[PDB]
Amino acid sequence: DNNTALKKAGLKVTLPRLKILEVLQEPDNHHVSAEDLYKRLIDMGEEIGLATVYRVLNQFDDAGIVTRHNFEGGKSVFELTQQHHHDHLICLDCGKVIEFSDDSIEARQREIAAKHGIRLTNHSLYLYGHCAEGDCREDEHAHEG
Amino acid sequence: DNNTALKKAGLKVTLPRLKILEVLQEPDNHHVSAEDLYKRLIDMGEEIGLATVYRVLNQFDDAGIVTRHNFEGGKSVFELTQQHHHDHLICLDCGKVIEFSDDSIEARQREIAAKHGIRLTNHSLYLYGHCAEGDCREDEHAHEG
Ligand SMILES: [Zn+2]
Ligand SMILES: [Zn+2]
Ligand SMILES: [Zn+2]
Ligand SMILES: [Zn+2]
Ligand SMILES: [Zn+2]
Ligand SMILES: [Zn+2]
Ligand SMILES: [Zn+2]
Ligand SMILES: [Zn+2]
User: What is the residue range of the signal peptide feature (chains A, B)?
Assistant: First the structure.
């Protein structure tokens, strides 16, 4: 299955490719920096250097497998292009990118475009803010509902 | 009044500056390309070249008077930074940038950030779509509610 999608993009089905795909399918890691991906890759105990993680993730974007984005101006973050629709809530103190989908917003967005003669075809919604209490740079649980 | 705000930014209060400010305060032109601003400037019959409109609008951004944005990837569009909060609905066939504000969305946005430990401090919401009926490149009335 992962084997099939890799070929559909144009990449030979190596193990480090299949292993990075599997980290990008974990729920905690739908939005992950190249390094945090390597941090996960070494917790699972894969001898896969950080330079190779960069190598592969860049190749994946070329083949439309993943989208990169600099939500923090600097820190690049990668996600599986093939995913259900969500928008992005980003914490400005610790860098955490949180996904979310609101059906009443996606609906009003269609309603607002249709009021002005427009059929909504794409949109981007980025939320930015600060940790409400304490310091999220310590509590890894700070941004989980 | 326009005189005061111009000084607050650091610019001498010339007439072409005050005249461009006045076009950027008209309701039709809250979001206007440099040229469409010159098109308005010549309807009012001001002998103000298009090159000077670029000159001034760039100076205004430096002094935080206006924000530029390339909503269409290419076409630059300018607006008065000092304005009530709105978001942006952009027509992909004709380039029209439409402003809008929804109180139920701005409220849910605060609710969604607060669910994940975040106090919402900034956000950007861009809507993109195509003209629903006919061809808006003809009907200037296509995107007015
Ligand atoms: Zn995402
Ligand atoms: Zn959305
Ligand atoms: Zn945080
Ligand atoms: Zn902060
Ligand atoms: Zn605007
Ligand atoms: Zn808004
Ligand atoms: Zn249009
Ligand atoms: Zn179209």
Answer: none
Q: In angstroms, what is the resolution?
A: 2.7
Residue B18: count other Cβ atoms within 10 Å of its Cβ: 12
Taking the C-alpha atoms of residue A140 and residue B10, their distance in angstroms, rounded to an integer, is 45
Residues of chain A with CATH 1.10.10.10: 1-81
Rounded to 5°, the CA angle A68-B95-A116 comes to 100
Q: Say how many CB pairs under 8 Å bridge A and B.
A: 116
Vertex B31 angle, CA B28 and B34, to 5°: 105
Which of B105, B127, B128, B140 should be substituted to probe chain A, the one whose Cβ sees the most A Cβ atoms within 10 Å? B127
CATH architecture designation of domain A84-145: 2-Layer Sandwich (3.30)
How far is ligand 3, taken at its centre, from the CA of residue A71, in Å? 13
Chain B residue numbers touching A123 (CB-CB < 8 A): 125-128
Count CB atoms within 10 A of the CB of residue B94.
18
Class of domain A1-81: mainly alpha
Asked whether the beta carbons of residue A102 and residue B108 sit closer than 8 angstroms, the reply is: yes
Q: CATH 1.10.10.10: which residues of chain B?
A: 1-83
